[PDB]
Amino acid sequence: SKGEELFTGVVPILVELDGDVNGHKFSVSGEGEGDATYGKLTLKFICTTGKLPVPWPTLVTTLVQCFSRYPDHMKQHDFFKSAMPEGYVQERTISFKDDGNYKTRAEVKFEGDTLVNRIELKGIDFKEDGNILGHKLEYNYNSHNVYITADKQKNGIKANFKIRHNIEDGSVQLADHYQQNTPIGDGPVLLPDNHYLSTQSALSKDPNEKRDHMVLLEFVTAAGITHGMDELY
Numbered sequence: 444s445k446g447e448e449l450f451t452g453v454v455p456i457l458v459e460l461d462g463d464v465n466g467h468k469f470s471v472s473g474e475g476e477g478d479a480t481y482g483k484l485t486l487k488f489i490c491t492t493g494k495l496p497v498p499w500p501t502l503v504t505t506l507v508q509c510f511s512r513y514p515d516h517m518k519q520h521d522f523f524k525s526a527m528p529e530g531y532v533q534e535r536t537i538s539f540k541d542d543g544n545y546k547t548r549a550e551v552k553f554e555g556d557t558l559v560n561r562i563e564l565k566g567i568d569f570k571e572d573g574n575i576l577g578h579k580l581e582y583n584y585n586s587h588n589v590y591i592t593a594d595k596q597k598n599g600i601k602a603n604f605k606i607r608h609n610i611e612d613g614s615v616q617l618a619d620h621y622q623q624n625t626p627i628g629d630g631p632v633l634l635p636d637n638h639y640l641s642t643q644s645a646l647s648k649d650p651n652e653k654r655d656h657m658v659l660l661e662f663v664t665a666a667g668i669t670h671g672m673d674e675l676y
């Protein structure tokens with residue numbers, strides 16, 4: 444697709460999130476860049492309202508899959524870039540096992556030459572001292588696959604996946620993700636065969652930053668589609 448042309452180099456990224464979890468209101472602003480050639484994201488997020496009322500790892504998935512590296516042989520399956528520059532709406536339900544849920548709505552689009560992710564997050568039915576509001580989740584992140592399928596009726600896609608958040612006692616907090624993406628513009632998009640995004644995420648801190656924040660290095664690579672290239676060798 445035509446949109447893929449927008450991603451051949453380093454693209455600046457801005458992320459802005461407004462959240463309410465159990466009446467705890469907060470905002471996050473992120474800045475960095477993406478280079479889809481390497482499936483690579485480098486971002487720093489700051490909670491601009493004070494202390495973040497949920498653990499940072501629980502927000503990683505909400506906080507630009509247009510930066511995934513789609514191998515050449517699978518580029519006809521890249522919905523995300525094909526919707527650019529007009530963008531897409533991304534909605535999720537994130538169900539924390541034995542606890543509350545996030546509902547998110549985002550618009551991901553270009554503003555000039557910057558890729559912007561604007562998000563509203565609503566969390567309900569969290570337990571006062573469960574793993575989320577009780578801050579019992581380690582500051583780390585496990586690799587996962589995002590399983591994508593076409594939704595041709597909506598001219599878009601759906602995804603399903605499980606995030607496993609490590610609890611500080613050695614256990615796991617499951618976060619089931621259900622996702623839908625639909626284009627903002629009316630131009631044609633790519634509707635993919637089933638495949639997945641292999642995602643690896645590393646969380647860190649800026650040693651000179653006093654605000655509540657998260658430094659993220661993430662690699663995202665599309666996979667899962669059959670090719671006959673081995674025959675070439």
Ligand SMILES: [Mg+2]
Nearest residue numbers: 543567568569
């Ligand atoms: Mg109720």
